[PDB]
Design a protein around this motif. Sequence first.
Motif, short mmCIF file in Angstrom:
data_model
loop_
_atom_site.label_atom_id
_atom_site.label_comp_id
_atom_site.label_asym_id
_atom_site.label_seq_id
_atom_site.Cartn_x
_atom_site.Cartn_y
_atom_site.Cartn_z
N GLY A 157 4.96 -10.38 0.15
CA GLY A 157 5.79 -9.57 -0.63
C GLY A 157 5.46 -8.21 -1.12
O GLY A 157 6.22 -7.57 -1.83
N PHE A 158 4.26 -7.69 -0.81
CA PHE A 158 3.82 -6.40 -1.31
C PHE A 158 4.28 -5.35 -0.32
O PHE A 158 4.13 -5.48 0.88
N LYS A 159 4.91 -4.29 -0.81
CA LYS A 159 5.33 -3.18 0.04
C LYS A 159 4.30 -2.06 -0.12
O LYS A 159 3.96 -1.62 -1.21
N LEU A 160 4.00 -1.45 1.03
CA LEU A 160 3.02 -0.35 1.04
C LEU A 160 3.47 0.83 0.23
O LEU A 160 2.67 1.52 -0.41
N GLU A 161 4.80 1.09 0.17
CA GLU A 161 5.24 2.23 -0.62
C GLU A 161 4.90 2.10 -2.08
O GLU A 161 4.82 3.11 -2.78
N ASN A 162 4.67 0.91 -2.60
CA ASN A 162 4.30 0.61 -3.94
C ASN A 162 2.82 0.56 -4.23
O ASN A 162 2.41 0.25 -5.37
N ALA A 163 1.95 0.80 -3.25
CA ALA A 163 0.53 0.74 -3.54
C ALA A 163 0.07 1.83 -4.51
O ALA A 163 0.66 2.93 -4.53
N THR A 164 -0.99 1.57 -5.22
CA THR A 164 -1.56 2.49 -6.18
C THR A 164 -3.05 2.57 -5.97
O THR A 164 -3.61 1.76 -5.24
N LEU A 165 -3.69 3.59 -6.53
CA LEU A 165 -5.12 3.77 -6.36
C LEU A 165 -5.96 2.59 -6.80
O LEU A 165 -6.97 2.29 -6.15
N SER A 166 -5.47 1.84 -7.80
CA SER A 166 -6.21 0.69 -8.26
C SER A 166 -6.26 -0.46 -7.27
O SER A 166 -7.14 -1.29 -7.36
N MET A 167 -5.43 -0.38 -6.22
CA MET A 167 -5.44 -1.41 -5.19
C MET A 167 -6.41 -1.10 -4.07
O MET A 167 -6.55 -1.90 -3.15
N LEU A 168 -6.97 0.09 -4.06
CA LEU A 168 -7.84 0.53 -2.98
C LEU A 168 -9.28 0.04 -3.22
O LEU A 168 -9.73 -0.01 -4.39
N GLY A 169 -9.98 -0.30 -2.15
CA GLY A 169 -11.40 -0.61 -2.27
C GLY A 169 -12.20 0.67 -2.26
O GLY A 169 -11.66 1.79 -2.10
N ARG A 170 -13.49 0.58 -2.53
CA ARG A 170 -14.36 1.74 -2.56
C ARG A 170 -15.64 1.38 -1.87
O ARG A 170 -16.09 0.22 -1.95
N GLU A 205 -0.40 10.80 -1.06
CA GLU A 205 -0.27 11.77 -2.14
C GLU A 205 -1.26 11.51 -3.26
O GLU A 205 -1.93 12.38 -3.83
N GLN A 206 -1.38 10.24 -3.62
CA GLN A 206 -2.28 9.82 -4.71
C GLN A 206 -3.72 10.09 -4.35
O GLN A 206 -4.49 10.53 -5.20
N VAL A 207 -4.07 9.79 -3.06
CA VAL A 207 -5.47 10.02 -2.74
C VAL A 207 -5.75 11.52 -2.59
O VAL A 207 -6.88 11.92 -2.83
N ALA A 208 -4.77 12.24 -2.04
CA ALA A 208 -4.96 13.69 -1.87
C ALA A 208 -5.35 14.32 -3.22
O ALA A 208 -6.15 15.25 -3.18
N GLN A 209 -4.78 13.86 -4.32
CA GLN A 209 -5.15 14.60 -5.56
C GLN A 209 -6.55 14.30 -6.01
O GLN A 209 -7.09 14.96 -6.92
N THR A 210 -7.21 13.26 -5.49
CA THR A 210 -8.53 12.86 -5.87
C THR A 210 -9.55 13.65 -5.10
O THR A 210 -10.69 13.68 -5.56
N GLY A 211 -9.21 14.23 -3.96
CA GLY A 211 -10.18 14.85 -3.09
C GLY A 211 -11.18 13.97 -2.37
O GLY A 211 -12.19 14.44 -1.80
N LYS A 212 -11.03 12.66 -2.46
CA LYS A 212 -11.99 11.74 -1.81
C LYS A 212 -11.40 11.24 -0.48
O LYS A 212 -10.21 11.37 -0.24
N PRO A 213 -12.29 10.80 0.38
CA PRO A 213 -11.93 10.38 1.74
C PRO A 213 -11.22 9.05 1.57
O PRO A 213 -11.41 8.27 0.65
N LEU A 214 -10.59 8.71 2.71
CA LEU A 214 -9.85 7.44 2.80
C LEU A 214 -10.01 6.87 4.20
O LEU A 214 -9.78 7.51 5.22
N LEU A 215 -10.35 5.56 4.19
CA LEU A 215 -10.31 4.74 5.38
C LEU A 215 -9.11 3.79 5.28
O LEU A 215 -8.94 3.08 4.29
#
Length: 145
Positions: free
Chosen positions: A115-128, A47-57
């Motif tokens: 201990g990190f759950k994927l449901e809690n990830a945020t855009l700031s955790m993503l690489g670019r 959902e978070q990435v969809a609003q950015t319009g950028k691709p995701l790997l």
Amino acid sequence: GYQFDKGYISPYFVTNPETMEAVLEDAFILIVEKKVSNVRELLPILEQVAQTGKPLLIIAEDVEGEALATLVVNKLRGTLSVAAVKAPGFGDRRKEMLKDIAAVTGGTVISEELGFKLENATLSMLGRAERVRITKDETTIVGGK
């Protein structure tokens, strides 16, 4: 460029059927240590990435089941530009290569065992990365950030 010897999990992820490659530009990179199977823990970050319009790997131990089906239908419909690949290696070698990928792209390894759950990830955790090229057999990450 940083290369590793795993390619796209599904050929529906191809972007250029001439070349049978997927090429993602100015992509986010989600690095997940676990197997992703349930749609529900992937939706939040999609959902978070969809609003950015950028691709995701997505790089994960594997992506299967309903989560894979969800990725395929959204890519085929043009709703998300996404691809998924399996993490290379096994055991400590796999954990080492995910750390290298995180370092190259500025991302964070999302590790359930720490201990990190994927449901809690945020855009700031993503690489670019400026460019990702994926074949049936390998992935290349160019201009990691």
